[PDB]
Amino acid sequence: KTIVSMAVIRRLPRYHRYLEELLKNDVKRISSRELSEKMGVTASQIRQDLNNFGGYGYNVEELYNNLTKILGLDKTYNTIIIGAGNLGQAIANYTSFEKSGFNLKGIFDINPRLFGLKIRDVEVMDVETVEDFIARNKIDIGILCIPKDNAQYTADRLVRAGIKAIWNFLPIDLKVPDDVILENVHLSDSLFTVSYRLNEEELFKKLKG
Amino acid sequence: KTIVSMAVIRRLPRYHRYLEELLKNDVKRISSRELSEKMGVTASQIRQDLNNFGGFGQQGYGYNVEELYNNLTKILGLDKTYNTIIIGAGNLGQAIANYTSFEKSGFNLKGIFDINPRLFGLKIRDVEVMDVETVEDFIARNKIDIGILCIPKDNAQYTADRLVRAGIKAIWNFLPIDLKVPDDVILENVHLSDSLFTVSYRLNEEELFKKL
C-alpha cells in the first residue's frame, strides 16, 4: 500500500516539527549529530530516512521545505467531519489543521436537532446527504468522529462516493479497499507512555530484586 | 529522563494494542515473524525491546498471546491506577473525559477545571467542573498524578506552571504547542498532526516518486 515504509513515514512529521522550530529560531544549519540526537534516531537512520527521497550538516530552510513537499503540505485538502458530538466539534475547532492547509467543508450528523447550526461558519448537515455533498464538493479526506453503531456503513458510503482518505478517531477496525487510505488515531499509544514513565522506577525496583 | 529509550517506550503500547486484539479473538499464539510483519519492527528489535524487562515464561519460538499481553500491561504500569484532572471543559476536554473512562480502567478522573464562572458546578461523567483558580489546592489534596491540558494556547504555559508548582507529576498536553516543564515532570505532547500528515503523505506518494 505504500512505497516508503510506514515506520519511515511516521518519523517524517516529527522531523518537520523540529525543522519548523529551528526555522522560526532563524537557525541556518544543523549537523546530523545534533539532529540524530534530538530525534533519538540513528544519525544513520535519519540520513537513511531522507535518502529515501534524495554536507555542512543540513541547511534548515532547504530540509524544511523538502519535508513540507514530501508530506504533501504544499497542497490544500478539503475535509469533512462525520459526527458533531464533543470530539467532532473539538476537531472542527482544532484550527492548527486549517492553518496547515486542511480546509473543513462540512460537518455531518444524524441528529435533526443540529441541522443548519454552524461551527466556525461550517454548517452541520444531515449525514444522509453526505454522498450528494461529496460529489459536488471535491472532498479529499473524511474524518470520522462517530460511535461504532453505523461506522462501517458510514465508511463504506464515503468510499462509494469516491473518498480516498479516512482519518478515523473511533477505536475500531474499519475495512476500506486497498486504494483508500485509512489512518486510525490511537490516543492510548500516547497515554500509556505516561503510565510507563510514572511506573518505570517501581517496575525496575520490582524486577531487579 | 528514562531508564529505557523513548523509541523503545513508544513501541510498547503498539505491541500491547495488537496483542489485545489477538487476545480478544482468542488467538493463542503468535510467531515472531507474524508479530514483526504486523508491527513493522524486526523480530530481533522486538526481542530486544522485551528483554529490557526480564523473561516472562517464554518457550520455543514466538509468543503466548495472553502471557505477552499481560507482561506488556505490567510493563506499561497499567496494573496501577493514576488520579487525573482535566483542565478545559470545552468540547476537547469533554471528549477526553469520555475517552478516559473507556480508559478509566486505570485513569481515574477526579475533577475538571475551567476559567468560565458559568460552569462552576456542572457535571460531566458525574465529575464536577470547578474553578481553575482552585486547582493547585485540589492537586495537593487529592494526590493528582496527571494533569491533562485541553485549554486554548492563551494561558497554557501559565496553566502548566501552576500544575507543576502544585506538585503534578505528569502533563498530557493536547495543545498544538510544546510546553516547558522541569526535567523531572513527565510531559507528553499529543501531536495529532503527526497522524494527519501521514494521510497527506500517502495521498501524494505516487506522484512524489513519479515526479522525483
Short mmCIF file of all heavy atoms in Angstrom, two decimals, chain B residues 150-194:
data_model
loop_
_atom_site.label_atom_id
_atom_site.label_comp_id
_atom_site.label_asym_id
_atom_site.label_seq_id
_atom_site.Cartn_x
_atom_site.Cartn_y
_atom_site.Cartn_z
N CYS B 150 -6.46 20.68 28.06
CA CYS B 150 -7.40 20.77 26.91
C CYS B 150 -7.90 22.22 26.80
O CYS B 150 -9.09 22.49 26.61
CB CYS B 150 -8.57 19.85 27.23
SG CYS B 150 -8.11 18.09 27.25
N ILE B 151 -7.03 23.17 27.10
CA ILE B 151 -7.43 24.57 27.06
C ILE B 151 -6.85 25.28 25.86
O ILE B 151 -5.99 24.72 25.16
CB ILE B 151 -6.92 25.29 28.30
CG1 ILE B 151 -5.55 24.75 28.73
CG2 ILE B 151 -7.94 25.17 29.42
CD1 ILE B 151 -4.91 25.73 29.65
N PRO B 152 -7.26 26.54 25.60
CA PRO B 152 -6.63 27.23 24.46
C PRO B 152 -5.17 27.54 24.75
O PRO B 152 -4.75 27.51 25.90
CB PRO B 152 -7.43 28.53 24.34
CG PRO B 152 -8.58 28.41 25.27
CD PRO B 152 -8.22 27.41 26.31
N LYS B 153 -4.38 27.88 23.73
CA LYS B 153 -2.96 28.23 23.93
C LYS B 153 -2.72 29.47 24.78
O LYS B 153 -1.67 29.61 25.43
CB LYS B 153 -2.30 28.44 22.58
CG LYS B 153 -2.61 27.31 21.61
CD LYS B 153 -2.01 27.62 20.26
CE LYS B 153 -2.14 29.11 19.95
NZ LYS B 153 -1.37 29.46 18.74
N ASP B 154 -3.71 30.36 24.78
CA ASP B 154 -3.75 31.57 25.60
C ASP B 154 -2.97 31.48 26.92
O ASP B 154 -1.81 31.89 26.98
CB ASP B 154 -5.20 31.99 25.87
CG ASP B 154 -5.83 32.73 24.69
OD1 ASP B 154 -5.63 33.96 24.61
OD2 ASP B 154 -6.52 32.08 23.85
N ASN B 155 -3.58 31.01 28.00
CA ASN B 155 -2.79 30.83 29.22
C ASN B 155 -2.36 29.37 29.49
O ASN B 155 -2.34 28.93 30.63
CB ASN B 155 -3.41 31.51 30.47
CG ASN B 155 -4.18 32.81 30.16
OD1 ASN B 155 -5.10 33.19 30.89
ND2 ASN B 155 -3.80 33.49 29.08
N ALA B 156 -1.94 28.64 28.44
CA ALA B 156 -1.39 27.30 28.61
C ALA B 156 -0.06 27.10 29.36
O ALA B 156 0.02 26.21 30.20
CB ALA B 156 -1.38 26.50 27.31
N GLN B 157 0.99 27.84 29.02
CA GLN B 157 2.21 27.70 29.77
C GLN B 157 1.98 28.13 31.23
O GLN B 157 2.49 27.50 32.16
CB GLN B 157 3.32 28.56 29.16
CG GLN B 157 4.68 28.47 29.84
CD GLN B 157 5.29 27.08 29.76
OE1 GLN B 157 5.45 26.52 28.68
NE2 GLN B 157 5.56 26.48 30.93
N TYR B 158 1.16 29.16 31.44
CA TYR B 158 0.90 29.60 32.80
C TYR B 158 0.16 28.47 33.54
O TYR B 158 0.48 28.15 34.69
CB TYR B 158 0.09 30.90 32.79
CG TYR B 158 -0.41 31.27 34.17
CD1 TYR B 158 0.48 31.53 35.21
CD2 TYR B 158 -1.78 31.28 34.44
CE1 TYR B 158 0.01 31.86 36.49
CE2 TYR B 158 -2.26 31.59 35.69
CZ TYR B 158 -1.36 31.89 36.70
OH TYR B 158 -1.87 32.16 37.93
N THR B 159 -0.78 27.83 32.87
CA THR B 159 -1.52 26.73 33.48
C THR B 159 -0.57 25.58 33.80
O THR B 159 -0.62 25.05 34.87
CB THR B 159 -2.72 26.29 32.61
OG1 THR B 159 -3.59 27.41 32.50
CG2 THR B 159 -3.52 25.13 33.28
N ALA B 160 0.33 25.25 32.88
CA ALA B 160 1.32 24.16 33.10
C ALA B 160 2.20 24.55 34.31
O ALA B 160 2.49 23.72 35.18
CB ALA B 160 2.15 23.97 31.84
N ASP B 161 2.57 25.83 34.42
CA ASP B 161 3.44 26.23 35.56
C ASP B 161 2.74 26.06 36.90
O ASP B 161 3.38 25.68 37.87
CB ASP B 161 3.87 27.71 35.43
CG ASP B 161 4.86 27.94 34.29
OD1 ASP B 161 5.46 26.97 33.78
OD2 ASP B 161 5.05 29.12 33.91
N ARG B 162 1.45 26.37 36.95
CA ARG B 162 0.66 26.23 38.16
C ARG B 162 0.59 24.77 38.54
O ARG B 162 0.66 24.43 39.74
CB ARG B 162 -0.80 26.70 37.96
CG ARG B 162 -0.93 28.18 37.62
CD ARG B 162 -2.40 28.43 37.54
NE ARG B 162 -2.98 28.48 38.87
CZ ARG B 162 -4.13 29.08 39.09
NH1 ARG B 162 -4.75 29.60 38.03
NH2 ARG B 162 -4.61 29.18 40.32
N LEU B 163 0.32 23.89 37.55
CA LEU B 163 0.22 22.44 37.93
C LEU B 163 1.53 21.93 38.46
O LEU B 163 1.59 21.15 39.42
CB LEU B 163 -0.19 21.53 36.74
CG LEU B 163 -1.43 21.95 35.97
CD1 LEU B 163 -1.71 20.95 34.83
CD2 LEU B 163 -2.64 22.08 36.82
N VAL B 164 2.62 22.33 37.82
CA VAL B 164 3.96 21.97 38.28
C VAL B 164 4.26 22.46 39.72
O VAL B 164 4.70 21.68 40.58
CB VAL B 164 5.02 22.51 37.27
CG1 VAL B 164 6.42 22.46 37.84
CG2 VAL B 164 4.94 21.70 35.91
N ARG B 165 3.99 23.72 40.02
CA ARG B 165 4.34 24.16 41.38
C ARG B 165 3.42 23.51 42.42
O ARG B 165 3.81 23.41 43.59
CB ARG B 165 4.29 25.68 41.50
CG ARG B 165 2.92 26.26 41.49
CD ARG B 165 3.00 27.79 41.57
NE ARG B 165 1.65 28.33 41.50
CZ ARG B 165 1.37 29.58 41.11
NH1 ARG B 165 2.35 30.41 40.79
NH2 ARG B 165 0.13 30.02 41.10
N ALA B 166 2.24 23.01 42.00
CA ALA B 166 1.39 22.30 42.95
C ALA B 166 1.80 20.86 43.15
O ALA B 166 1.19 20.15 43.97
CB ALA B 166 -0.09 22.40 42.60
N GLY B 167 2.85 20.42 42.44
CA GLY B 167 3.35 19.07 42.61
C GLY B 167 2.91 18.03 41.60
O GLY B 167 3.00 16.84 41.86
N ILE B 168 2.36 18.46 40.47
CA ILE B 168 1.90 17.48 39.46
C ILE B 168 3.07 16.63 38.98
O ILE B 168 4.22 17.09 38.92
CB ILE B 168 1.19 18.19 38.23
CG1 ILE B 168 0.21 17.22 37.55
CG2 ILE B 168 2.20 18.67 37.17
CD1 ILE B 168 -1.07 17.21 38.25
N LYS B 169 2.82 15.37 38.64
CA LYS B 169 3.97 14.51 38.19
C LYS B 169 4.08 14.38 36.68
O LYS B 169 5.16 14.07 36.14
CB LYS B 169 3.88 13.09 38.78
CG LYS B 169 3.82 13.06 40.35
CD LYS B 169 3.75 11.56 40.79
CE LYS B 169 3.89 11.39 42.32
NZ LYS B 169 2.78 12.09 43.03
N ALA B 170 2.97 14.58 35.98
CA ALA B 170 2.96 14.46 34.52
C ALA B 170 1.85 15.33 33.97
O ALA B 170 0.80 15.53 34.64
CB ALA B 170 2.57 13.02 34.18
N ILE B 171 2.07 15.75 32.73
CA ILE B 171 1.13 16.53 31.97
C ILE B 171 0.93 15.87 30.63
O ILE B 171 1.91 15.54 29.91
CB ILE B 171 1.66 17.99 31.77
CG1 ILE B 171 1.57 18.70 33.14
CG2 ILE B 171 0.79 18.72 30.72
CD1 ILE B 171 2.18 20.12 33.13
N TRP B 172 -0.34 15.66 30.30
CA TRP B 172 -0.69 15.14 28.96
C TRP B 172 -1.27 16.32 28.18
O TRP B 172 -2.34 16.85 28.51
CB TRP B 172 -1.69 13.97 29.12
CG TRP B 172 -1.86 13.11 27.90
CD1 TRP B 172 -0.90 12.85 26.95
CD2 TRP B 172 -3.01 12.37 27.53
NE1 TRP B 172 -1.38 11.94 26.01
CE2 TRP B 172 -2.69 11.66 26.33
CE3 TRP B 172 -4.27 12.19 28.10
CZ2 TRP B 172 -3.62 10.88 25.66
CZ3 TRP B 172 -5.20 11.38 27.43
CH2 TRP B 172 -4.84 10.68 26.26
N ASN B 173 -0.53 16.80 27.20
CA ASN B 173 -0.79 18.13 26.63
C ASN B 173 -1.45 17.98 25.23
O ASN B 173 -0.78 17.52 24.34
CB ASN B 173 0.53 18.88 26.46
CG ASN B 173 0.36 20.21 25.71
OD1 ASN B 173 -0.69 20.87 25.80
ND2 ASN B 173 1.37 20.57 24.91
N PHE B 174 -2.71 18.36 25.07
CA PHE B 174 -3.38 18.31 23.75
C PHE B 174 -3.22 19.57 22.88
O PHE B 174 -3.73 19.61 21.75
CB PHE B 174 -4.86 18.06 23.91
CG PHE B 174 -5.16 16.62 24.18
CD1 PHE B 174 -4.98 16.12 25.46
CD2 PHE B 174 -5.43 15.76 23.12
CE1 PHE B 174 -5.22 14.77 25.71
CE2 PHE B 174 -5.66 14.40 23.34
CZ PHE B 174 -5.52 13.91 24.65
N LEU B 175 -2.58 20.59 23.41
CA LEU B 175 -2.44 21.82 22.65
C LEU B 175 -1.29 21.70 21.70
O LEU B 175 -0.23 21.21 22.09
CB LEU B 175 -2.21 23.03 23.53
CG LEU B 175 -2.61 23.23 24.99
CD1 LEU B 175 -2.82 24.75 25.13
CD2 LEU B 175 -3.80 22.44 25.53
N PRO B 176 -1.46 22.26 20.49
CA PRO B 176 -0.51 22.10 19.42
C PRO B 176 0.71 22.96 19.65
O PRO B 176 1.24 23.50 18.70
CB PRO B 176 -1.29 22.62 18.19
CG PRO B 176 -2.17 23.69 18.75
CD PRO B 176 -2.57 23.17 20.13
N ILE B 177 1.16 23.07 20.89
CA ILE B 177 2.38 23.79 21.27
C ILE B 177 3.21 23.03 22.33
O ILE B 177 2.66 22.43 23.24
CB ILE B 177 2.00 25.14 21.83
CG1 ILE B 177 1.73 26.10 20.66
CG2 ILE B 177 3.05 25.68 22.79
CD1 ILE B 177 1.07 27.38 21.10
N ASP B 178 4.53 23.07 22.21
CA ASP B 178 5.40 22.35 23.13
C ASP B 178 5.78 23.15 24.40
O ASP B 178 6.60 24.08 24.37
CB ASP B 178 6.60 21.77 22.38
CG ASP B 178 6.22 20.57 21.48
OD1 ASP B 178 5.01 20.33 21.22
OD2 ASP B 178 7.13 19.83 21.05
N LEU B 179 5.17 22.73 25.52
CA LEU B 179 5.30 23.40 26.83
C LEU B 179 6.66 23.21 27.51
O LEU B 179 7.35 22.26 27.20
CB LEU B 179 4.20 22.90 27.77
CG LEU B 179 2.80 23.17 27.24
CD1 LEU B 179 1.83 22.56 28.21
CD2 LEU B 179 2.50 24.65 27.04
N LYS B 180 7.01 24.09 28.43
CA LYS B 180 8.24 23.98 29.20
C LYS B 180 7.88 23.47 30.62
O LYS B 180 7.06 24.11 31.29
CB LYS B 180 8.88 25.35 29.38
CG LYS B 180 9.37 26.01 28.08
CD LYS B 180 9.88 25.01 27.07
CE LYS B 180 9.95 25.65 25.68
NZ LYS B 180 10.66 26.96 25.76
N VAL B 181 8.51 22.37 31.05
CA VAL B 181 8.36 21.86 32.43
C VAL B 181 9.74 21.43 32.89
O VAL B 181 10.63 21.16 32.07
CB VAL B 181 7.40 20.60 32.51
CG1 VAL B 181 5.94 20.95 32.01
CG2 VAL B 181 7.94 19.51 31.68
N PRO B 182 9.93 21.29 34.21
CA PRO B 182 11.19 20.84 34.76
C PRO B 182 11.43 19.42 34.29
O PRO B 182 10.49 18.67 34.01
CB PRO B 182 10.96 20.88 36.29
CG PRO B 182 9.91 21.92 36.48
CD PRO B 182 9.04 21.91 35.23
N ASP B 183 12.69 19.03 34.28
CA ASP B 183 13.11 17.76 33.71
C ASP B 183 12.51 16.58 34.46
O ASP B 183 12.43 15.47 33.93
CB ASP B 183 14.63 17.63 33.76
CG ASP B 183 15.33 18.40 32.65
OD1 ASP B 183 14.66 18.97 31.77
OD2 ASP B 183 16.58 18.45 32.67
N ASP B 184 12.09 16.79 35.70
CA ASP B 184 11.59 15.66 36.48
C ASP B 184 10.10 15.40 36.24
O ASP B 184 9.57 14.39 36.71
CB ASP B 184 11.82 15.89 38.00
CG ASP B 184 11.12 17.13 38.49
OD1 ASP B 184 11.61 18.21 38.12
OD2 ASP B 184 10.05 17.08 39.20
N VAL B 185 9.42 16.35 35.59
CA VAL B 185 7.99 16.25 35.31
C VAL B 185 7.85 15.57 33.95
O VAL B 185 8.53 15.95 32.99
CB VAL B 185 7.34 17.67 35.25
CG1 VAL B 185 5.83 17.61 34.82
CG2 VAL B 185 7.47 18.36 36.66
N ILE B 186 6.99 14.58 33.85
CA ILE B 186 6.78 13.91 32.55
C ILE B 186 5.91 14.82 31.68
O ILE B 186 4.86 15.25 32.15
CB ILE B 186 6.08 12.55 32.72
CG1 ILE B 186 7.01 11.58 33.45
CG2 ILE B 186 5.76 11.91 31.33
CD1 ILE B 186 6.28 10.55 34.36
N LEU B 187 6.33 15.15 30.45
CA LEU B 187 5.45 15.96 29.59
C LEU B 187 5.22 15.19 28.31
O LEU B 187 6.18 14.85 27.64
CB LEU B 187 6.07 17.31 29.21
CG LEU B 187 5.36 18.11 28.08
CD1 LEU B 187 3.87 18.52 28.41
CD2 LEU B 187 6.15 19.37 27.78
N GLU B 188 3.97 14.82 28.03
CA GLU B 188 3.69 14.06 26.79
C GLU B 188 2.82 14.96 25.90
O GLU B 188 1.67 15.29 26.28
CB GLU B 188 2.95 12.75 27.14
CG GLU B 188 2.32 11.99 25.94
CD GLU B 188 3.37 11.46 24.93
OE1 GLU B 188 4.60 11.63 25.15
OE2 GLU B 188 2.91 10.88 23.90
N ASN B 189 3.41 15.45 24.81
CA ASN B 189 2.69 16.31 23.87
C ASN B 189 2.00 15.45 22.86
O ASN B 189 2.59 14.55 22.20
CB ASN B 189 3.58 17.37 23.16
CG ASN B 189 4.33 18.28 24.12
OD1 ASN B 189 3.73 19.01 24.93
ND2 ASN B 189 5.65 18.26 24.02
N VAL B 190 0.69 15.66 22.77
CA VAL B 190 -0.04 14.95 21.75
C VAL B 190 0.16 15.79 20.50
O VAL B 190 -0.13 17.01 20.45
CB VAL B 190 -1.56 14.82 22.08
CG1 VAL B 190 -2.29 14.04 21.02
CG2 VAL B 190 -1.83 14.06 23.44
N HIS B 191 0.49 15.11 19.45
CA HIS B 191 0.80 15.75 18.19
C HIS B 191 -0.16 15.07 17.22
O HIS B 191 0.27 14.28 16.44
CB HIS B 191 2.27 15.36 17.84
CG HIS B 191 3.30 16.02 18.74
ND1 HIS B 191 3.39 17.38 18.90
CD2 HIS B 191 4.32 15.48 19.47
CE1 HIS B 191 4.38 17.67 19.72
NE2 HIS B 191 4.95 16.53 20.09
N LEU B 192 -1.46 15.37 17.25
CA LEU B 192 -2.40 14.83 16.25
C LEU B 192 -1.96 15.06 14.79
O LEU B 192 -2.24 14.26 13.92
CB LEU B 192 -3.76 15.53 16.43
CG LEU B 192 -4.48 15.20 17.74
CD1 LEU B 192 -5.93 15.81 17.71
CD2 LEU B 192 -4.61 13.69 17.90
N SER B 193 -1.39 16.23 14.52
CA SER B 193 -0.89 16.47 13.14
C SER B 193 0.13 15.43 12.69
O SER B 193 0.24 15.14 11.47
CB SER B 193 -0.40 17.93 13.02
OG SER B 193 0.91 17.98 13.53
N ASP B 194 0.85 14.79 13.62
CA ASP B 194 1.80 13.75 13.18
C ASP B 194 1.01 12.63 12.50
O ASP B 194 1.51 11.98 11.55
CB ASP B 194 2.58 13.12 14.34
CG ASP B 194 3.70 14.02 14.89
OD1 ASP B 194 3.83 15.20 14.49
OD2 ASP B 194 4.43 13.52 15.79
#
